[PDB]
Design a protein around this nucleic acid. Structure first.
Ligand SMILES: Nc1nc2c(ncn2[C@H]2C[C@H](O)[C@@H](COP(=O)(O)OP(=O)(O)OP(=O)(O)O)O2)c(=O)[nH]1
Ligand SMILES: [Ca+2]
Ligand SMILES: [Ca+2]
Ligand SMILES: [Ca+2]
Length: 342
DNA sequence: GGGGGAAGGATTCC
DNA sequence: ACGAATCCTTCCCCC
């Protein structure tokens, strides 16, 4: 009887760019992450639907994008801006419920149980929220409504873009039998592939398997998550999430193993990681390396007290040395991550 | 046998 | 090809 309302902003980064420069609307827009290795080295962060019609979507190389749509509008990612627009929209949402879970820069779950009853009122509260967000910030979003967070999210995926949908108890039961298990949040290609070999292509299929076999192949946590959803029993509460890590990682002009060559990038990473820390003081620091073969290796250390920036600098070099020493590959990307805030 | 935690990697998804 | 959360496996120290 928990009634959950999930909000997911439409093609967010690109839409914010449109809002900030309305002449862009209707034109294919592609927000890019430029790495600096060469001409258009980098990847697409996201694109509006005009561009997605033709295959230009999040994750593909900018070069592949331009081959497909050479006359599209290509803009560099401005996350700070998108984050501030997001914050304002999240504030508007806090008005519809006091129980809100900001899941990311562009999604939030609202528990509107003691805010309205039955789904009709749920649906209407959705249009109000959509309209309110469209009128106030001029951003279109998709609303998903169901009994728990997972199905509210699924409802939204099904109604994208600029939609609103309700998945009532009856359809839930149908989806537990009908839904491709790969479409269940938290299930990626890796877990999807493991679930197939076990003969699980639908949530329901997880109940026809030996738990220890499931647990054995995908882990205890994931196993209980899926079984729980198949039993129409998943029911996680909507809570306030708090930042737990702040980091930065940059691509070097060229790959390397030379310490003095990597340092400047690593220190640049820490500088910006600290400015983002605000007043937050971390007890743990990790140096993260992305190797030439796009592998991710890391070495860290937790201290029994906070880490001053001079300490972070000194410790980061020691961890980068551990990496170079323990890993033979050249380093492509280097950065740092601070956590366990006092 | 287990609690309790740190450490490095795996997997997922804004 | 360009940030952050959770869980898993392995160690480790210890009662
Ligand atoms: N840098 C980078 N940013 C991403 C990536 N994927 C998503 N983002 C950022 C930008 C997206 O606009 C934002 C929201 O992600 P979504 O998966 O919901 O996609 P978007 O909202 O763009 O499209 P949508 O209408 O929800 O299908 O998160 C990525 O692969 N790299
Ligand atoms: Ca979205
Ligand atoms: Ca999203
Ligand atoms: Ca999937």
């Amino acid at each position: 009887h928990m009634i959950v309302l999930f909000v997911d902003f439409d093609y967010f980064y690109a839409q914010v760019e449109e809002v900030l420069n309305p002449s862009l609307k209707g034109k294919p827009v592609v927000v890019c992450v430029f790495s600096g290795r060469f001409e258009d080295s980098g990847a697409v962060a996201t694109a509006n639907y005009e561009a997605r019609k033709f295959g230009v979507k999040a994750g593909i190389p900018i070069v592949e994008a331009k081959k497909i749509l050479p006359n599209a509008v290509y803009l560099p990612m401005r996350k700070e801006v998108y984050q501030q627009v997001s914050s304002r929209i999240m504030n508007l949402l806090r008005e519809y419920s006091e129980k809100i879970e900001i899941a990311s820069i562009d999604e939030a779950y609202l528990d509107i149980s003691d805010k309205v009853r039955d789904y009709r009122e749920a649906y209407n509260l959705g249009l109000e929220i959509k309209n309110k967000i469209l009128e106030k910030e001029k951003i279109t979003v998709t609303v998903g409504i169901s009994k728990n967070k997972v199905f509210a999210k699924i409802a939204a995926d099904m109604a994208k873009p600029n939609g609103i949908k309700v998945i009532d108890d009856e359809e839930v039961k149908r989806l537990i039998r009908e839904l491709d298990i790969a479409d269940v949040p938290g299930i990626g290609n890796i877990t999807a592939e493991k679930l197939k070999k076990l003969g699980i292509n639908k949530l329901v299929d997880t109940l026809s398997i030996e738990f220890d076999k499931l647990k054995g192949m995908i882990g205890e946590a994931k196993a209980k998550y899926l079984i729980s959803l198949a039993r129409d029993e998943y029911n996680e509460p909507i809570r306030t999430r708090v930042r737990k890590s702040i980091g930065r990682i940059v691509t070097m002009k060229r790959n390397s193993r030379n310490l003095e060559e990597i340092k400047p990038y690593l220190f640049r990473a820490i500088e910006e990681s600290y400015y983002k820390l605000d007043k937050r003081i971390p007890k743990a620091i990790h140096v993260v390396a992305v190797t030439e073969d796009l592998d991710i290796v890391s070495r860290g250390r937790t201290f029994p007290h906070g880490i001053s920036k001079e300490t972070a600098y000194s410790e980061s070099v020691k961890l980068l040395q551990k990496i170079l020493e323990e890993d033979e590959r050249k380093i492509r990307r280097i950065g740092v991550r601070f956590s366990k805030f006092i």
